[PDB]
């Protein structure tokens, strides 16, 4: 009856909001600069929000758009103080390098000699370097040039920075909060029944791969399938395994790095030669586990296309080399693995010993993904290379009998695969409500 | 006892969440948000630091001009215009959560903030006249 306004400070009410997220990390230097992040609390406080049901929309999330610009800016920051390789854009005299091997695999790597500047501006030098075939083009004789010379400048990565992803934790400023959808069968959109709040997200490695998602987070039940319009064939389907299907990759050739003084203070790191055999870089994935895991994807794909329909896996249908292959980084080199042996299967309405092998090629001059004029030279890695990782998801694409083929050269699809359960909200701690209280 | 944690009673009833206000109060200027380097992460953390003190001081300034400095629960002299909400006391504090309450009171929250503002300015004018003797 007699009711007055009463003010409350610190009431549990929040609103959807965009804000700048800083980085937390655990205790040389990597491109992700995780040494500059605030140390993660060893006790990552998670608070459960009983009786709370929040709306989510992983396809409008700003955390992925913020991480997308962050990682690009981190690479930009890491390549700033390094060496410009514009003197390397010069006429190359190249020959095939040894190993009179299987026909048309000797051109896959080349032995190239060229005239290079020295520490004295007026005195040239004749040096040589081993270059992969994908990093050079012909002139039309045996003359060549670096692949990037007509489109982009090139900057070699400072060889002391590690390309190995370190787990990043994204945090919200004071007065904001991160909400996590703890729904074990969460689509990525809609009212999440189970919700908790966290100061910082879990550890997320900034792994940029294609087709196959590597070293990611696993679902706890079944195997979810996420698109914003699954009935639309132009929206990439993001699948997420619950079991990790392992993959072993290697560059067996024992390379040597040869430093070349191209100027005062500037040194270009060439590929010296190969100690021992010249073999083929490749990846192994157990044929048994990949068939089982490729079947779980089929079961969940059925719920969107019918218990009776037949779905088929085919290989990529063209595009740039990064998107037609399982491209990734391994021990410092950038592999490009043919995946026709992974998506060549037709499944009806209703091995066990060996594994399937994937021939990978290797690039050193890799181009920027959504920009032109900027390109990076990855320095040669010495020794034998071998990395072991799990495939925890895919990036598929429907054509519109159903046929699914991989792809996806958009970095923020990688970040969606980890940030789907997180959402940023701002706290509004002021609340007014009536009660029979009166001042004085 | 209970102690649900930060925002732990966001789904609870307004009367139940209203007893654990200090839980949300202390987390409005801390978090984990020493040299100032202007790296890609360093700029990000600086913005996170300035932003928190900004949004914190806006709320404290409102509590100030309302006469509710340093209070988590202050009572006022603005009567409850039933056109804001014709709900009764029990069907609010023992039924609604602060989130769904804020949803339906949101239109008039600016009207209420003005009445609280001038109620305090007229109140401080009266207290001066009373102490003038």
């Amino acid at each position, epitope marked *: 009856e007699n009711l007055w306004v009463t003010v409350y400070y610190g009431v549990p009410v929040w609103k959807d909001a965009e804000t700048t997220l800083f980085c937390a990390s655990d205790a040389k230097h990597n491109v992700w600069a995780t040494h500059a992040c605030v140390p993660t609390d060893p006790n990552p406080q998670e608070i459960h929000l009983e*009786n709370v*049901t*929040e*709306e989510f929309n992983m396809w409008k999330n700003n955390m992925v758009e913020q991480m997308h610009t962050d990682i690009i800016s981190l690479w930009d920051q890491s390549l700033k103080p390094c060496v410009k390789l514009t003197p390397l854009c010069v006429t190359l005299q190249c020959t095939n390098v040894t190993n009179a091997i299987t026909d048309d695999m000797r051109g896959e790597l080349k032995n190239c000699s060229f005239n290079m500047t020295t520490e004295l501006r007026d005195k040239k030098q004749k040096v040589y370097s081993l270059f992969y075939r994908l990093d050079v083009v012909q002139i039309n004789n045996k003359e060549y040039r670096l692949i990037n010379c007509n489109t982009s400048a090139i900057t070699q990565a400072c060889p002391k920075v590690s390309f190995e992803p370190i787990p990043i934790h994204y945090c919200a400023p004071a007065g904001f909060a991160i909400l996590k959808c703890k729904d074990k069968k969460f689509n990525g959109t*809609g*009212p*999440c*029944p189970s919700v908790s709040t966290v100061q910082c997200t879990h550890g997320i490695k900034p792994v940029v791969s294609t087709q196959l998602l590597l070293n990611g987070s696993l679902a706890e039940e079944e195997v979810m399938i996420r698109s914003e319009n699954i009935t639309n064939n132009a929206k990439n389907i993001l699948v997420q395994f619950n079991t990790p299907v392992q993959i072993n990759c290697t560059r067996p050739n024992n390379n040597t790095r040869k430093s070349i003084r191209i100027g005062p203070g500037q040194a270009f790191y060439a590929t010296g030669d190969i100690i021992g055999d010249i073999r083929q870089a490749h990846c192994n994935v157990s044929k048994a586990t990949w068939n089982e895991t490729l079947g779980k994807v089929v079961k969940q794909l059925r719920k969107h296309f019918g218990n009776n329909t037949i779905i088929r896996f085919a290989n990529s249908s063209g595009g740039d080399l990064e998107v037609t292959t399982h491209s990734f980084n391994c021990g410092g080199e950038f592999f490009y693995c043919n995946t026709s042996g992974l998506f060549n299967s037709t499944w009806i309405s209703n091995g066990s010993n060996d594994s399937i092998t994937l021939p990978c090629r290797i690039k050193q001059i890799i181009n920027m993904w959504q920009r032109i004029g900027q390109a990076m030279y990855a320095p040669p890695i010495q020794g034998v290379i071998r990395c072991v990782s799990n495939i925890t998801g895919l990036i598929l694409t429907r054509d519109g009998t159903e046929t699914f083929r991989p792809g996806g050269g958009d970095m923020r699809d990688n970040w969606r695969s980890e940030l789907y359960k997180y959402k940023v909200v701002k706290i509004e701690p002021l609340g007014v409500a009536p009660t029979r209280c009166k001042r004085r | 006892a209970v102690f649900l944690g930060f925002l732990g009673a966001a789904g609870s*009833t307004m*009367g*139940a969440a209203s007893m654990t206000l200090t839980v949300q109060a202390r987390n409005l200027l801390s978090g984990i948000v020493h040299l100032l380097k202007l790296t890609v992460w360093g700029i990000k953390q600086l913005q996170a630091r300035v932003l928190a003190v900004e949004r914190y001081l806006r709320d404290q300034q409102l509590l100030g001009i309302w006469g509710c400095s340093g209070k988590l629960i202050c009572c006022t002299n603005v009567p409850w215009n039933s056109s804001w909400s014709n709900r009764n006391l*029990s*069907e609010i504090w*023992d*039924n609604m959560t602060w*989130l*769904q309450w804020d949803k339906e009171i949101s239109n008039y929250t600016q009207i209420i903030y003005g009445l609280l503002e001038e109620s305090q300015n007229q109140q401080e004018k009266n207290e001066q006249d009373l102490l003038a003797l």
Partner: nanobody
Amino acid sequence: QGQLVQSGATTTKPGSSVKISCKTSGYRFNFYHINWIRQTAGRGPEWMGWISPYSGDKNLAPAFQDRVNMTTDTEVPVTSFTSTGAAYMEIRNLTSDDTGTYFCAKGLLRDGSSTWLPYLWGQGTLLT
């Protein structure tokens, strides 16, 4: 708002056991109890029991203590404050003297001294 659509008008004979369905909309199904009330003709209205769609806890009259099975299945989020639930009613040593109209009604408030009080009712179901 709030709706509680009830099942059909079942018709059986003594000895059997029938299930009554109560399907809810327009409100969070977990926040309020579900009450079962009986309006027989040869007696005054009888409160049978209520059950907690959140805690699973149940409470019924001694006249139904070992004769009735009250159950609910988990709700389905529609929006932040709207879900859809269901409540089930069963009788054991059933005769024909239990004939009448059966209602389902949700609780009144989420806290206080009248939490479970049957506030919003269904349209009822005729029986044997």
